[PDB]
Nucleic acid binder design. Structure first.
Lengths: 271, 88
RNA sequence: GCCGCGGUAAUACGGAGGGCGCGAGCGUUACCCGGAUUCACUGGGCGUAAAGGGCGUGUAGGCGGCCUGGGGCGUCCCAUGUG
RNA sequence: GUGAAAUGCGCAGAUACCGGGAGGAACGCCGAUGGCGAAGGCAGCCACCUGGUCCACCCGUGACGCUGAGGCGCGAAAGCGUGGGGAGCAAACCGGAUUAGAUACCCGGGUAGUCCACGCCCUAAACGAUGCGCGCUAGGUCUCUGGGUCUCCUGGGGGCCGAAGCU
RNA sequence: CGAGCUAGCCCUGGCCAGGGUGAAGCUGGGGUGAGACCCAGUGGAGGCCCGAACCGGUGGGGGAUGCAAACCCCUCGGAUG
RNA sequence: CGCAGUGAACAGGCUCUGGCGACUGUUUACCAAAAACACAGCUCUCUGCGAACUCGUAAGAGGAGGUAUAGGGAGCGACGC
RNA sequence: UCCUAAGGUAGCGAAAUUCCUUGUCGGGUAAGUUCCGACCUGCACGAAAAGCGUAACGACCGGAGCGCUGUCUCGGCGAGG
């Protein structure tokens, strides 16, 4: 729904926040499965290797289930929709009949009290997970494995989906959130429906702190540095790159394709 | 829709003397029922402007009448309105 | 004054002869009413001449079928004061 | 492809034909001088919600009516905001033609836009260029839709010709 | 050999006198066919305002073998991010 | 009752009109605080996941326990037109 | 008519951009190489190294008033180190 604020301050004029209808009636996360402390840390063995990352609210990690084929045939009730700091989509805590609990990346439509289940048997309805073969060609579907038994890799950003496009032997044609068209193995599970919290794209951050709260440090333009510092760097008063735009590292950044030519991922992709 | 029964029950429930099918008091309670039922509908289908017209036509009728009713009789004017829930 | 007059034969300009009107006046300009039923009550209209509101819903207001009495504000008549 | 052309596409394998798939828009025939709607306007099929209307039965209320300054709502297309979609078509824009010139008319492309949602905008040859309600004043002709002890009679609607009258 | 200065990030702690302004939401009334909305009352939001601590370092004067290898004075910026 | 009542001390001078930058912020420690950088937001571009990209001879790790509404690079820098 | 790959649109314009320049007209003042409003022959603006505007913000740079003053006419006296 996206709350918009009255301008009792500049900046709070452009800022908009999420509705939280979404999740209601459950905030403190599930002490049990949920938490491992999450490790803030914006680089590897010494050196920063992602620029401009750091700061931002101390944050606990919710351990979700991206491999639902453990619990084939066991249904579970959807117990609550709760807030996840660690991703754009919201999550649903569901108690399996099994006793056992886990978090699924909460698909659109899903509502407290629903029962949900995974297997080749499963009804073709919201939140249920299934091999791609036993899912009807045309349905949209998210949290898709890419190789069988490897965990859900596709379609987990808030409001994403993929669509079953066709069959083809052990394999099955898939239109991805990008627009790419990719064969994925029939045994690769996927959960019917799309992702939801799909207003997520429309938050207007609103000011430059906040950007900080989410741990995004300020990003200094190329020209804006000096030549030691960057390709664009230099120039007496203000400058026009001076051919052709480039990362700090030098490699071209307007139009240059980067994916590896002879990748065996090829032959599976088609867009 | 509004069934035969739901209709009748309202009518026999607001009559002046069993058999009375017209009458100010009843005519009203007919619309009221239609209205709320309609009221309820437009609340979902906001974009249905055509059907909204009719509502405004009834709304008048109801008014039209109530003003007659009130003019002749303050007594069973309260009765109706209160035992029916209107005046906004 | 309005329509218009004068480009070599002008009853329209200028003079002249004659003629019409009014007369100690006669003309002009200004302004009011009139003609103007051209803000229309008396007394105009809106298909194409200028004029129907793009269409509904309804507030104030305007207007109101048949019949019987009560009042008599509008309405009519009489006298009288004033005018 | 045109008036004839040229731009353009095509031996890097087009056009023409076949099979398999993707996607969006608009619904042929029925279809009419037809119907519905206060207007704008509404057209493949299905289901649900919902408005107005017509006929018959003379059962009920008992003048509860008509109109409506202002207010309030709706209001084609174009256009605007946020986001989705984008096959076809297409302002702008570019190419080829024509021409004295051609910022056009014709041809090859082509971006918004056209579509969805949500919110604005409020105009129009928004035209019957004819405000609403009622009563009254020859008929003829064909048509849609209802009701009748259905060669016909009656009610509601859509056209044509015309008494009186008006112009 | 150095990050016991300085720059960034990570882990865990601590700090921000007191004033002012008064968003949303509630409640109530008014409103309508329902609404939208408008009214009080409550409420307590913000890289909100004044201003100590704290952080700073704008302008001027002083210092200039200095109190000082960047200091002193008046003035000034931020002060729940 | 005084010339005088925030009687001492702490304690804003105001107005009109241009240029630049939307904004609070950051900087040349020690001559520059700005019209510089940053910034919410706009566009282009790469990346289908053993992602692209970065550090590393490698193993490895960041990216991210994220997955196109997400991540890298680049430019403009609220908003209006 | 010659040349080009094509010849600057909107909007701005003596500007942080104008050399000639103190351009020229207007405003402001007793007097204005600055300022403000205009006019363009724009030496050498112009659309995302954005174009033209913009409420509010500013220890940012320009131009006027009013208040007040030892800044000054022009200096004098006094206190302390």
């Amino acid at each position: 729904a996206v709350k918009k604020f009255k301008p009792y301050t500049p900046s709070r004029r452009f800022m908009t926040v999420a509705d939280f209808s979404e999740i209601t009636k459950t905030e403190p996360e599930k002490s049990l499965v949920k938490p491992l402390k999450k490790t803030g840390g914006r680089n590897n063995q010494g050196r920063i290797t992602v620029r401009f990352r750091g700061g931002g609210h101390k944050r606990l990690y919710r351990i979700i289930d991206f491999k639902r084929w453990d619990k084939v045939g066991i249904p579970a009730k959807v117990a609550a929709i709760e807030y996840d700091p660690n991703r754009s989509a919201r999550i649903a805590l569901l108690h399996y009949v099994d006793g056992e609990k886990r978090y699924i990346i909460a698909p659109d439509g899903l509502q407290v009290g629903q029962q949900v289940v995974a297997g080749p048997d499963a009804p073709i309805q919201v939140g249920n997970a299934l091999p791609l073969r036993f899912i009807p060609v045309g349905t949209v579907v998210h949290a898709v494995e890419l190789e069988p038994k490897k965990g859900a890799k596709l379609a987990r950003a808030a409001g994403t989906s993929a669509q079953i496009q066709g069959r083809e032997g052990d394999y099955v044609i898939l239109r991805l959130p990008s627009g790419e068209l990719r064969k994925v193995h029939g045994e690769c599970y996927a959960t019917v429906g799309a992702v939801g919290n799909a207003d997520h794209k429309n938050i207007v951050l609103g000011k430059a702190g906040r950007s900080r709260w989410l741990g995004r440090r300020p990003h200094v333009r190329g020209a804006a540095m000096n030549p030691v510092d960057h390709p664009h760097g230099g120039g007496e008063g203000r400058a026009p790159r001076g051919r052709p735009p480039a990362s700090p590292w030098g490699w071209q950044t307007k139009g240059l394709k980067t994916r590896k030519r002879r990748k065996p991922s090829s032959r599976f992709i088609i867009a | 829709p509004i069934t035969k029964e739901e209709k009748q029950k309202v009518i026999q429930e607001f009559a002046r003397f069993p058999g009375d099918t017209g009458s100010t008091e009843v005519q009203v309670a007919l619309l009221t029922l239609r209205i709320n039922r309609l009221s309820e509908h437009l609340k979902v289908h906001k974009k249905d402007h055509h059907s909204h017209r009719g509502l405004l036509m009834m709304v008048g009728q109801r008014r039209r009448l109530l003003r007659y009713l009130q003019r002749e009789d303050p007594e069973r004017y309260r009765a109706l309105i209160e035992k029916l829930g209107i005046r906004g």
